[PDB]
Design a binder for this molecule. Structure first.
Ligand SMILES: *[C@@H](O)[C@H](C[C@@H]1CCNC1=O)NC(=O)[C@H](Cc1ccccc1)NC(=O)OC(C)C
Length: 181
């Protein structure tokens, strides 16, 4: 195996999980310890179904910027026996673009799915489903419903979480390392 394939597959094995909430199927990224992140519109409750079992959520934090604007990420703390492989080192310190990125998706309906979204560019403001959203990036790929939560990766870096699209383009909430300090 080569390095990019090894890194994405290792992500899938160790950090990228199949989940279901009242809102349906999402991909969840486990970041470190018992901390994971999901798209805010997943609306996780007191418990979330992860892979094969119902897991209790100890805390949820919906991220907003200084202006009070939605970042579309929710940080959840899980009541789990053991800790996620810490991948904060692979998340850049500031929101970063990339070339030839891959979107990694893992849902019961779309298990271990790799989508070659291409170049990921700065986008900023986005209005999705009526909610105004900052710090997003864009890829020119017609991503689908069911792909939210999907992890945007390139060259050994984890840079975003898929949050929507418009039938021609896809968007992610950018990730920065300080969200997970
Ligand atoms: C995953 O949640 C889903 C994926 C979209 C559907 C088509 N392309 C995609 O990749 N995203 C959405 O459904 C969001 C919903 C959203 C976003 C932010 C805040 C609240 C809800 N987009 C969406 O519904 O698109 C509108 C143009 C209808």
């Amino acid at each position: 195996m080569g390095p990019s394939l090894d890194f994405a597959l290792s992500l899938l094995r160790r950090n990228v999980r199949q989940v279901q909430t009242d809102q349906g199927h999402f991909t969840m990224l486990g970041v470190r310890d018992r901390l994971a992140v999901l798209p805010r519109h997943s609306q996780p409750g007191k418990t979330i179904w992860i892979e094969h079992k119902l897991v209790n959520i100890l805390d949820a934090v919906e991220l907003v910027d200084e202006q009070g604007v939605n970042l579309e990420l929710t940080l959840i703390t899980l009541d789990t026996n053991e800790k996620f492989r810490d991948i904060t080192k692979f998340i850049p310190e500031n929101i970063s673009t990339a070339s030839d990125a891959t979107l990694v998706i893992n849902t019961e309906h779309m298990p271990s799915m790799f989508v070659p979204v291409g170049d990921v560019v700065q986008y900023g403001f986005l209005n999705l489903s009526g909610k105004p959203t900052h710090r997003t990036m864009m890829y020119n790929f017609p991503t689908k419903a069911g792909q939210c939560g999907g992890v945007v990766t390139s060259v050994g870096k984890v840079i975003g979480i898929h949050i929507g699209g418009n039938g021609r383009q896809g968007f992610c909430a950018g990730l920065k390392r300080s969200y997970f300090a």
